[PDB]
Amino acid sequence: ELLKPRTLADLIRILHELFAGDEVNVEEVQAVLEAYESNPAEWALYAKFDQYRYTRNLVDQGNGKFNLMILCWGEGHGSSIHDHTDSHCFLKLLQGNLKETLFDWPDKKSNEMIKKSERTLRENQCAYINDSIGLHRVENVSHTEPAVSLHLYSPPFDTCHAFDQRTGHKNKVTMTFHSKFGIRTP
Ligand SMILES: [Fe+2]
């Protein structure tokens, strides 16, 4: 039943099964993501980089219940501190490394956001975040190696909040897709 994905295509089929229902077995989804061994040739089509910031490239629109996408992080590129809009969010490294910094939800008082923790996500590892866990910022701190990650969100969402680290104030951000199914979408 839970079988090792042989290919990205195979993983995508398995994901369609795991999200056949109304709920989400987070551990099984994370297990399957982690078991797929990144094969660059199978995701080259989606790995479209931008010189100035990380790009989000839609891979599969899911069955209504999730989106699967590939994020490409140039050297030194990172995200804001942000939430995931009441969704499950899985992140699997396909190439390089990313630093994830965890932050607590801020209190309504204006205060510096101090980090709860940090980790280095390494190739093939799959992390999970959701709002009840906290907020995070994800960065590729490498000076020399681009990173590529595979992200699954469920339900799909196209807006989130970015947080100001000095004060914890949030602002709503609309998320863009740099490409969809291999096609650049300006
Ligand atoms: Fe995130």
Curated annotation (Swiss-Prot):
Cofactor(s) essential for the protein = Fe cation; Ni(2+); Zn(2+)
Co-factor: note: Binds 1 Fe cation per subunit. Ni(2+) and Zn(2+) can be used to a lesser extent.
Q: Cross-link 3'-(S-cysteinyl)-tyrosine (Cys-Tyr) maps to which residues of the chain? A: 89-153
Task: Write down the EC number.
Answer: 1.13.11.20
Modifications the protein undergoes after translation, according to the UniProt entry:
The thioether cross-link between Cys-89 and Tyr-153 plays a structural role through stabilizing the Fe(2+) ion, and prevents the production of highly damaging free hydroxyl radicals by holding the oxygen radical via hydroxyl hydrogen.
Describe the reaction catalysed, as an equation.
L-cysteine + O2 = 3-sulfino-L-alanine + H(+)
Q: What induces it?
A: By increase of sulfur amino acid intake.
- Could you name the domain of life of the organism this protein comes from? Eukaryota
Molecular function GO terms recorded: cysteine dioxygenase activity; ferrous iron binding; nickel cation binding; zinc ion binding
A Gene Ontology cellular component where this protein is annotated is:
cytosol
* Tissue note: Highest levels in liver. Significant expression also in kidney, lung and brain.
Pfam assignment, any one? CDO_I
Keywords (alphabetical) are: Dioxygenase, Iron, Metal-binding, Oxidoreductase, Thioether bond
**What's a GO biological-process term for it?**
response to cAMP
Amino-acid positions noted as binding Fe cation in the UniProt annotation, renumbered to this chain: 82, 84, 136
Q: State which pathway it belongs to.
A: Organosulfur biosynthesis; taurine biosynthesis; hypotaurine from L-cysteine: step 1/2
Q: Which residues form a coiled coil?
A: none
This chain's function reads: Catalyzes the oxidation of cysteine to cysteine sulfinic acid with addition of molecular dioxygen.
Family assignment from sequence similarity: Belongs to the cysteine dioxygenase family.
Quaternary organization:
Monomer.
This one is known as Cysteine dioxygenase type 1
Originating organism: Rattus norvegicus
